């Protein structure tokens, strides 16, 4: 995945198939186009963006107060 930004994308030169990313059987590097696995952008945008803003609230916590039921 480094060949994308390493080589100049405006100059083409190939060396980059983009995705690659996984294979669940043979344990090899296979493009997602040939594998046929894609997901909507909403699976990332408005997902991790909402999760990151939710997780940083835990780091904001300083003390903890617990009140047992009477």
């Amino acid at each position: 995945h480094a060949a994308s930004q390493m080589a100049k994308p405006e100059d083409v030169k190939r060396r980059s198939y983009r995705n690659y990313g996984l294979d669940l059987i043979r344990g090899k590097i296979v493009d997602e186009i040939h594998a046929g696995v894609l997901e909507p952008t909403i699976s990332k945008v408005k997902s991790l963006k909402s999760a990151l803003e939710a997780c940083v609230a835990i780091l904001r916590i300083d003390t903890m107060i617990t009140v047992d039921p009477e």
């Binding site: 916590i61 300083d62 003390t63």
Partner: protein, 43 residues
Amino acid sequence: PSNATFKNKEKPQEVRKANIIAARSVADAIRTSLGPKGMDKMI
């Protein structure tokens, strides 16, 4: 010429000491929550 004194009870702060310490624990709580650089809490 000395005179002066005027002490009687020797622990006037004893009642007002631990209460400030109890108030300092509450005061130290808002110090971490003060300003945009502060922190949040959970209750």
